[PDB]
């Protein structure tokens, strides 16, 4: 095949490499990922008032998206501009979470372009807001049989609340010309009002916990990204592996004498990655690419006979009438202690001839 | 075939996504042409069009230029579905809302 002919005359030939070694692909990643405090906002039992919503900042952690799927028997979730499924793989450099409790009938008011008492006096959502909104019933934990009045919502304000604004002023709203001066009465009503959360009340009046998530993209290194899945680790036997993106193929042994703890890779004279440290176990294991091919073949001319002998170049005779030479390993020929004239050179003063095939 | 606006970006070699994994896959060495034009006037009605369907769930991706018409109940868990919808038992193909 290599010689592009159907007949090859006597002499050594350096044949090419053939056959297929399939192997398989694996991937590793650093052991353990620092989870973002999602449950510190959701799994927390107590919430603040809608007019005094909780605002939390998240940074320097991984954000797993699997726990949120198990949050309530039925929760309403919607993002503006970003599809549900493709939220995990995105990378964000800032994210902000606002959480509060509202009335079920006014949940739809928490949306861009919406109006109402809450949308103008408690929390305004900007029209161009990108991010997500999650809402779910909380009548079990935010209502008691005696009419809990802890949560409260604003009712009166001089101006409509701006997007991303927090108003917690408790000053008496003046509904007339005469001043209030801190005295309740006519034309002077308390801007703060509290719902009546009761288990017997309708779902419209039943409390609903609402959390909005806003993605902030500052010119800084990212801090909110999806988790990285780590596959298994095949060792010893020559396989392909991919560590953090870089490739390798072959055996895995130590290359460590004084490997610096902070060092990660190790290059040879070719500036090619040979030694790599596994993120898990942090042990060191080199590559030594396998799948060697290019054996040599010694044969007389086909016009004469058909037998051949193989010569593996520079390989020990236990890594594959077997004979061992300085040049490599010889298979298919028998060594003779006699002496003759050189016919087919091999190397290191060894010559082969066809009398079967003999080497001397 | 009829497709959902955005999707057009999937019909191209090397692209991924639902249509490009369970419904219609192009080989990497493809040669030819692609014509795509909006048809909101005809294929969409204010009365609701639901004769156009697309597969959503499949165990494995398709080879290039492959067609699947099996309507067996998808299995998402260890328990068999026995041809009945339920938990971990969803109809593989969804519908297309055109308005």
């Amino acid at each position, epitope marked *: 095949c290599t010689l592009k002919s159907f007949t090859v005359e006597k002499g050594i030939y350096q044949t090419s490499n053939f056959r297929v070694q399939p192997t398989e692909s694996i991937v590793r990643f650093p052991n353990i990922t620092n989870l973002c405090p999602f449950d510190e906002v959701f799994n927390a039992t107590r919430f603040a008032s809608v007019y005094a919503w909780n605002r939390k900042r998240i940074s320097n952690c991984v954000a797993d998206y699997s726990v949120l*799927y198990n949050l309530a028997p039925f929760f309403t979730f919607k993002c503006y501009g970003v599809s549900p499924t493709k939220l995990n793989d995105l990378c964000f450099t800032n994210v902000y979470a606002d959480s509060f409790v509202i009335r079920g009938d006014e949940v739809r008011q928490i949306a861009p372009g919406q109006t109402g008492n809450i949308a103008d006096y408690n929390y305004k959502l900007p029209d161009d807001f990108t991010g997500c909104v999650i809402a779910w019933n909380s009548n079990k934990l935010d209502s008691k049989v005696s009419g809990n009045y802890n949560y409260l919502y604003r009712l009166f304000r001089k101006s409509n609340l701006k997007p991303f604004e927090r108003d917690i002023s408790t000053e008496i709203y003046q509904a007339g010309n005469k001043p209030c001066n801190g005295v309740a009465g006519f034309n002077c009503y308390f801007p703060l009002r509290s719902y009546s959360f009761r288990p017997t009340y309708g779902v419209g009046h039943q409390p609903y916990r609402v959390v909005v998530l806003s993605f902030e993209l500052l010119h800084a290194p990212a801090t909110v990204c999806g988790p990285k899945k780590s596959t298994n680790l095949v060792k010893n036997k020559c396989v392909n592996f991919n560590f953090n993106g870089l490739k390798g193929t072959g055996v895995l042994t130590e290359s460590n004498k004084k490997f610096l703890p902070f060092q990660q890779f190790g290059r040879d004279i070719a500036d090619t990655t040979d030694a790599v440290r596994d993120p898990q176990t942090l042990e060191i294991l080199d590559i030594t690419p396998c799948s060697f091919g290019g054996v040599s073949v010694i044969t007389p001319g086909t016009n004469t006979s058909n037998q051949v002998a193989v010569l593996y170049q520079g390989v020990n005779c236990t890594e594959v009438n077997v004979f061992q030479t300085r040049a490599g390993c010889l298979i298919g020929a028998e060594y003779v202690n006699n002496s003759y004239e050189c016919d087919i050179p091999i190397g290191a003063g060894i010559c082969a001839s066809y009398q079967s095939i003999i080497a001397y | 075939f009829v497709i959902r606006g955005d999707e057009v970006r999937q019909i191209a070699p090397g692209q991924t996504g639902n249509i490009a994994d369970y419904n219609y896959k192009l080989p990497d060495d493809f040669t030819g042409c692609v014509i795509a034009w909006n048809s909101n006037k005809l294929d969409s009605k204010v009365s*609701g069009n639901y004769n156009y369907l697309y597969r959503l769930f499949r165990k494995s991706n398709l080879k290039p230029f492959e067609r699947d018409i099996s309507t067996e109940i998808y299995q998402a868990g260890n328990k068999p579905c026995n041809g009945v919808a339920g938990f971990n038992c969803y109809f593989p193909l969804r519908s297309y809302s055109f308005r």
Partner: nanobody
Amino acid sequence: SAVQLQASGGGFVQPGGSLRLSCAASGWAETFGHMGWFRQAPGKEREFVSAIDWWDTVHYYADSVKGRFTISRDNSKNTVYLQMNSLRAEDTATYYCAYWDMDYLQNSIPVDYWGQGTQVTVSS
């Protein structure tokens, strides 16, 4: 959106009797989509039966069943109920629990999910 619907009730009854059907919704959706029931007969098409909202504010019944079928929403367990009374022979068919994911139901045409068929037979 991922909504799973479960249907409960049905069976064999007599004309003029009473019955209770129910549907429960689980998972997540775009908004507080309304809930309804449809009825399909063997050899015929599906027929709109009843539609209610997520807060018991809008009631919609088909003209042929106006004032006879009733639909209600519970307050604490998320399960919608369909109260049925004074059945006749034309009510023997398979009911389905239909969900539509939007805030205002202009028409019953846009359907995203269905429910398990519940067989309701009315005979002597």
